[PDB]
Amino acid sequence: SHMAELTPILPFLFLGNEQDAQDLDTMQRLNIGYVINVTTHLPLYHYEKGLFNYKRLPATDSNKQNLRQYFEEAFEFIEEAHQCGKGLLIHCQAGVSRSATIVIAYLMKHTRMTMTDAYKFVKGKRPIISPNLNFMGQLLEFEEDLNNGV
Numbered sequence: 584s585h586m587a588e589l590t591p592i593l594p595f596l597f598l599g600n601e602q603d604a605q606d607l608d609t610m611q612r613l614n615i616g617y618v619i620n621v622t623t624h625l626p627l628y629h630y631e632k633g634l635f636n637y638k639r640l641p642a643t644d645s646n647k648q649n650l651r652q653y654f655e656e657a658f659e660f661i662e663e664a665h666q667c668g669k670g671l672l673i674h675c676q677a678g679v680s681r682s683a684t685i686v687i688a689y690l691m692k693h694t695r696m697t698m699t700d701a702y703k704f705v706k707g708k709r710p711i712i713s714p715n716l717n718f719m720g721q722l723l724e725f726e727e728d729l730n731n732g733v
């Protein structure tokens with residue numbers, strides 16, 4: 584069977600794929616209470632159990648998907664877990680391309696890392712990340728907006 588590998592980017596921020604998000608035991612052992620689903624078609628796992636607060640970001644893994652519009656909605660959702668001492672799991676699909684894009688944006692926003700330093704930070708903890716030239720460009724546009732105060 585699949586062994587869940589919830590990569591801890593920060594002690595309260597976890598990242599994974601669709602298979603990593605279906606493991607209920609590890610999520611409770613890691614004290615997560617917030618889940619971010621960055622897909623349009625995947626179900627909110629363990630919704631019928633009333634254990635987590637869910638937020639879905641309806642995004643596709645295409646060359647036209649806009650992920651910048653969902654950054655601030657996810658940052659406040661991650662910050663609401665930070666302020667109450669609980670963990671957050673953000674996940675999408677196999678390549679973890681979408682969910683790692685927001686995590687890099689979060690490390691870029693609240694830790695003041697450069698896009699490469701933030702990318703090298705997440706790449707060292709989860710070595711398998713599918714490339715997406717669209718999301719790379721949106722992260723580059725996001726970095727210069729951070730360097731100019733927006």
Ligand SMILES: CC(C)(C)C(=O)CSc1ncc2c(n1)-c1ccsc1CC2
Nearest residue numbers: 683684698699702712713714715718719
């Ligand atoms: C969408 C996402 C960023 C998660 C991705 O597509 C991972 S793949 C990749 N491979 C080589 C580089 C980079 N990303 C990168 C990222 C930012 S600056 C840079 C320069 C080398």
